[model samples]
Target chain A: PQITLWKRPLVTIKIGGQLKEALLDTGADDTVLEEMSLPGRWKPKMIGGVGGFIKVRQYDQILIEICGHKAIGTVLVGPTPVNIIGRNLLTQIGCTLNF
Target chain B: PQITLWKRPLVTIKIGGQLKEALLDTGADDTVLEEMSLPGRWKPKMIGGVGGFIKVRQYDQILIEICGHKAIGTVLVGPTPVNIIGRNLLTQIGCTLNF
Candidate 1:
């Protein structure tokens, strides 16, 4: 499916049966979400971006549904200002920059 | 043109007669370049991301050629850890996330 780029490339994602809007971040190395509760054990990891570094819990192989495309990948939850969909899941969905 | 997302989504860009590789950052609001000398007056602005805040010289109305596409837009120069191509230039080239 093709998505339109608005002022913000916002999209709906379903994770752990919860739907949320996430920024499609091509610059990010990992997918990040706001603080959330996960059922399984996760490892603590640090991710850095333009602003700085943030601590997150790395949940491996979580089921995620983005715009109806289902995929199992790593999901990081933490005190992130915004929920970002990075290439981790983007590649699974065959995402590319169409110019 | 379609770009394969490697470990990093890097692309060749030509700005101010210099060609450089930039990360295609869909998460960034503005385009940021490493330390470079531009032949114009620019305004001082601050940009923040996951890391922290960085002072940048906002040189507006600059020309950038990305992947052979010519575009004139705002280019910020400073001590950026990475070269990022934000949505500002991505939109000009009609980019989208293809899933």
Candidate 2:
């Protein structure tokens, strides 16, 4: 028997002082930001992961304030190839994925 | 002055016994799974969040085993409107955002 898989829609959000567009992943747990991609002065801290502790950083926890709606949360710092947008931001904005 | 926002491509992964396609978000910290979307016998645990501890569950920590690459990690259980992907998978696969 074959297994069934689930999927969701991807939303884009602006990051950094530069307003870089990033995909908002509802499936993700915490917000992630690329180390080099972020603007100057967005500090991240190290956090624990399934394997062990990893370096993490924090950014402004603000409302995306897009299209008259607010998506609130902090951006995270991580390695490059920047893929950000997590559950905290989704829940904050009361976002629901359309299949 | 306006900020420059960075964005990356969304990769799809198969989850549960159903093999659903989920977008991989590098900025996210952990993997998330929707309650209603997963197949049978895939269990998850509860964990804490920024505000407080939240409910989480676990699923098989297997490699995507796609495109001859392996993205290994566990799946998390959470409320409806399923969206599950995070950094753990990205780092495991040695992915880089093209931006």
Candidate 3:
């Protein structure tokens, strides 16, 4: 699927048996999700963005179906404005930035 | 240009007669650059992202050459981890996300 930049590159994703919309963020290094509950043990981590930094929970080996493509990677649960599908998961789904 | 997800989507951009590298960030609504000097008077503004918010200077109608394609839009200057080419500028260059 080819997504135009006329708008934000947002796509649907499935995680933990629930469906959610996420942005395919090429600038993000790791995938971060809004406050959500997921199974498994997670470690406390801090991540920085264009602004400052925030504390988050890191869950490893999580399964996320992005736009119908299943990908396994680390997911960070934190106070994000929106769900972000970063390079870690984008690479698995073979996503690219084209012009 | 088709950029694979194997590496960060860093591209060269020329702004204010200076060349710098920036990431193609679909998750970001506006373009933000690191501390730099530019011509013209700008207004103080604040923007939020993944972790938190930051104070920045907003310059409108700035000319930026992204990957050799020219674009004119608002550019925010602040303390950012990296220079980001957000949707505001991506649209001008006709960038897209493809899978």
Question: Which of 1 and 2 is the better model by TM-score?
Answer: 1
TM-score, prediction 1: 0.93
What is the Cα-based TM-score of model 3?
0.95
CAPRI-wise, candidate 3 is: high
True contacts kept of each: 0.74, 0.04, 0.88
Kindly list the per-residue Cα lDDT of model 1 for residues B31-53, writing each as its tens digit. 99999999788999998777668
Query: Comparing 2 and 3 by DockQ, which wins?
Result: 3
TM-score of each: 0.93, 0.38, 0.95
**Using TM-score as the measure, what is the rank order of every candidate, best first?**
3, 1, 2
Model 2 chain B poorest 10 in a row by lDDT: B1-10
Model 1 steric clash pairs = A51-B49, A51-B50, A51-B51, A51-B52, A52-B50, A52-B51, A52-B52
The count of backbone overlaps in candidate 1 is 7
Candidate 2 lDDT over B1-99, as tens digits, reads 111122222345554445554554443466665553443456646554332244666666554532235666766767523354665665555443321
What residue runs in model 3 are displaced by over 4 Å at the alpha carbon? Answer: none
Cα lDDT, model 1, residue A22: 90
Task: Provide the global lDDT of candidate 3 against the true structure.
Answer: 0.92
Worst 10 residues of 1 chain B by lDDT: B1-10
Q: Per-residue error at A39 for model 1, in Å?
A: 1.4
